[PDB]
């Protein structure tokens, strides 16, 4: 009551429209690479260090860097103030973002090292994990880390009987399914795929196809954020 009408959604988006997305790379001095993203009401910052000295050693891998990811929401990012510190949700998101970024990375290039991805959600409005993945790729590119592709991500979802792109909080709260997807778009390699909800097979596949188009759309934004950095560097 009523998330689609007519056939406009609450903020005015058609079924297959994305929320306004802005992205900036190079927002932090300390981080090796960093990116900032406003995707809706999402405001997410992503930082990468380095490749660097893994501690502790016994973690090192002899042939490759490891990727460590930490997704965290600031207490003030959600409507109900969230007690600081991770929780089960943020730890599974870290895990799945890791599993999202790792296949883009050429980790055997930096043996015995860690590459550390931090994702801080400053404001949260559904889709933080896809937004985070997206800023994370850009922060990885920003860090000068060889990647086979960027990873772009985007969720699709089912609201009021209907498959839609890029759920907002409200629509995910009242929705019937949420399907984030991350891909490396050059090869259409799906590196994240989750489905929370209830869906038929053909509902689920359409959601995947759709969130991927959202992901390719996001990817164009990503490249444009890198272009804009490679123009900004080009002085002098």
């Amino acid at each position: 009551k009523l998330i689609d009408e007519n056939g406009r959604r609450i903020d005015g988006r058609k079924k297959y429209e994305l929320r306004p997305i802005k992205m900036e790379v190079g927002v932090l001095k300390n981080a090796n690479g960093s990116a900032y993203i406003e995707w809706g009401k999402n405001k997410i910052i992503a930082a990468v260090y380095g490749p660097r000295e893994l501690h502790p050693k016994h973690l090192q891998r002899p042939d490759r860097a490891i990727l460590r990811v930490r997704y965290n929401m600031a207490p003030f990012s959600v409507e109900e103030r969230k007690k600081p510190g991770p929780d089960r949700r943020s730890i599974e998101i870290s895990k799945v973002i890791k599993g999202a970024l790792e296949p883009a990375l050429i980790l055997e290039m930096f043996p015995r090292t860690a590459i550390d991805v931090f994702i801080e959600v400053l404001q949260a409005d559904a889709g933080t994990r896809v937004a985070g993945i997206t800023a994370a790729s850009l922060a990885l590119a920003d860090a000068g880390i060889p990647m086979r592709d960027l990873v772009a991500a985007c969720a699709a979802g089912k609201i009021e009987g209907e498959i839609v792109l890029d759920l907002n909080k409200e629509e995910d709260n009242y929705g019937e399914a949420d399907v984030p997807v991350a891909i490396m778009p050059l090869k259409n390699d799906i590196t994240l795929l989750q489905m929370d909800g209830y869906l038929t097979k053909d509902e689920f596949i359409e959601a995947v196809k759709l969130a991927i188009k959202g992901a390719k759309a996001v990817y164009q934004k990503q490249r444009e954020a890198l272009k804009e950095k490679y123009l900004k560097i080009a002085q002098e």
């Binding site: 730890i91 599993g99 296949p103 489905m195 929370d196 038929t200």
Partner: protein, 267 residues
């Protein structure tokens, strides 16, 4: 290890797997329900040599303020150090947390446990259901083993009949027991991608060499109530499509073994 990736890959190129399973075969499955007889429900599931026990303990409690209309369900997976040299003592790690969450989402989102049929006094007193998963031997595919055992323990569950005394306001827990409102049977089916091949119910040896993993949980109604690509690697859309299809087929074969095990424990 490492020497094994190659043997495994090469076997896979020849349509073979190291235990002679086909790409779509589960290992021998054993489900035994009601094995913890002090718990309200339990299930010991063996997927080959993978062994998980799931115990279901219910109490009465307050529902979440958000939802006065719904019982409580909470799922925890303990990866006990005894199950594996990789399992260390302490709070859940990200593996345990992802297994608990995906199994929970499976059941919660299919409403396989109907939380609405677990209200006693709206807003005040609901049935509270702990799904505690105790992994006893990790030999691969904990995801499916756990989902199978979670659901089968829920089906097994016999909780005390509770009644609201409208003359006293008392809640009387009765000796007589009753099933939990379990209305669906979600079953995770999980695939390891190795190279360009997906293989169902990965053993530990296949998990060590896999590129990535994807789990698809479906119920009798032809619905998906959880998907989780886990670990690294990447799947193709058509890989995912196949996996959803195959998962439905495997789930059904599994649900038959679950229900059979559930019924056996009533004889």
């Amino acid at each position: 290890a490492g020497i094994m990736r190659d043997h495994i890959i090469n076997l896979l190129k020849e349509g073979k797997r190291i235990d002679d399973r086909g790409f779509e075969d589960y290992r021998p499955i054993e489900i035994e329900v009601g094995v913890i007889e002090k718990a309200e429900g339990s299930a010991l599931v063996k997927l080959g040599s993978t062994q998980v026990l799931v115990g279901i303990k219910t109490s009465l409690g307050e529902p979440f303020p958000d939802t006065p209309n719904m019982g409580v369900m909470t799922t925890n997976v303990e990866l006990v150090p005894l199950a594996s040299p990789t399992f260390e003592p302490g709070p859940p790690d990200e593996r345990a947390i992802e297994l608990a969450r995906v199994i929970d989402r499976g059941i919660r989102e299919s409403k396989a446990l109907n939380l609405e049929k677990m209200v006693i006094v709206p807003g005040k007193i609901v049935r509270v259901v702990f799904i505690d998963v105790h992994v006893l031997d990790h030999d691969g595919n904990l995801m499916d083993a756990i989902g199978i055992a979670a659901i089968a323990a829920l089906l097994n569950a016999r909780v005390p009949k509770v009644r609201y005394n409208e003359e006293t306001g008392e809640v009387e827990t009765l000796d007589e027991t009753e099933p939990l409102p379990v209305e669906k049977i979600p079953v995770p089916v999980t695939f390891a991608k190795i190279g360009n091949i997906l293989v169902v119910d990965p053993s530990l040896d296949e998990e060590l060499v896999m590129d990535g993993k994807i789990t698809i949980t479906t119920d009798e109604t032809g619905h998906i109530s959880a998907v989780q690509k886990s670990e690294g690697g990447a799947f193709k859309l058509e890989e995912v499509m196949y996996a959803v299809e195959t998962a439905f087929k495997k789930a059904e074969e599994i649900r038959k073994l679950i229900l059979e095990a559930v019924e056996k424990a009533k004889q």
